[PDB]
Design a protein around this nucleic acid. Structure first.
Length: 222
RNA sequence: CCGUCGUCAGCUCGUGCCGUGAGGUGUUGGGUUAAGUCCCGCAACGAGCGCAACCCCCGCCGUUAGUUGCCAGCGGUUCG
């Protein structure tokens, strides 16, 4: 799929906190705010989306990451739609470098889910009960989407690259491709497949991700 | 084998990350606790030794048990 000239939604976000390297993606300043040149965002989308089709039909896995408060309720949604994994609540340092050590945390969920169905529930100390009840509680937060990761992902779809420069760092080191919805404040020089655009705006995050996923699905043929 | 700091709440490790390196991070900060007790947060996620917990006494109650116990209810007293 392709997009329209939907310009009533992305056309810049941040004030004057920008990163000089982003210049290549700005139109001009208006009322002290940078405005992204959309004619250019179209040139980038037409490539990034290419990458995803490639990935998708090749049957790949894209980890969706966005710890921003605004994208919270969106990230959850979209990933769930492919079969994609995602990082909603908070991004754990090493969910990719130290994966084998974290995937261990995953098994801890697996093993607890089990106990809370089996007969060994109320039967045994209750102090531990609470103690164990809380552990799932926390897991069913952070790991909620990571769970789907059988092995490290073929690409990451990050939202605020500068906020998730930890995730990006990691990936960058493990040679996993980076796809992010970036703008004024990011270092484009580190994002394999950029998507220059506003993002605090639900209206922006929502569009950028939906059109991506629709790409994802139509790619596999559903 | 014991005294002692000290029943104090600490002491550390794997892997990850930071640093040429000694080392650091985790264990920290904000809240909380009797406690590194727990919450929130954070390049960390866990784990070990320690805290706690499992064990004994005390306080309520139940079941099993009646040569301690009692007119608690009845019959006699040298009415103990």
């Amino acid at each position: 799929v392709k997009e329209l000239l939907e310009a009533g939604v992305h056309f810049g976000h941040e004030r004057k906190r920008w990163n000089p390297k982003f210049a290549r993606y700005i139109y001009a300043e208006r009322n002290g705010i940078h405005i992204i040149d959309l004619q250019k965002t179209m040139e980038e989308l037409e490539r990034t989306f290419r990458f995803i089709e490639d990935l998708a039909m090749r049957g790949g896995t894209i980890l969706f990451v966005g710890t921003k408060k605004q994208a919270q309720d969106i990230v959850r949604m979209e990933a769930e739609r492919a079969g994609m994994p995602y990082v909603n609540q908070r991004w754990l340092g090493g969910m990719l470098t130290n994966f084998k050590t974290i995937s261990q945390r995953v098994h801890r969920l697996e093993e607890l889910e089990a106990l809370f169905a089996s007969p060994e529930i109320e039967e045994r100390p209750k102090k531990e009960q609470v103690r164990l009840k809380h552990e799932l509680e926390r897991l069913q937060k952070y790991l909620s989407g990571f769970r789907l990761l059988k092995r490290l992902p073929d690409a990451i779809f990050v939202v605020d690259p500068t906020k998730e420069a930890i995730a990006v760092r990691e990936a960058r080191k493990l040679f996993i491709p980076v796809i992010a919805l970036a703008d004024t404040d990011s270092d484009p020089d580190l994002v394999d497949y950029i998507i220059p655009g506003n993002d605090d705006a639900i209206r922006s995050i929502q569009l950028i991700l939906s059109r991506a996923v629709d790409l994802i699905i139509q790619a596999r043929g559903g």
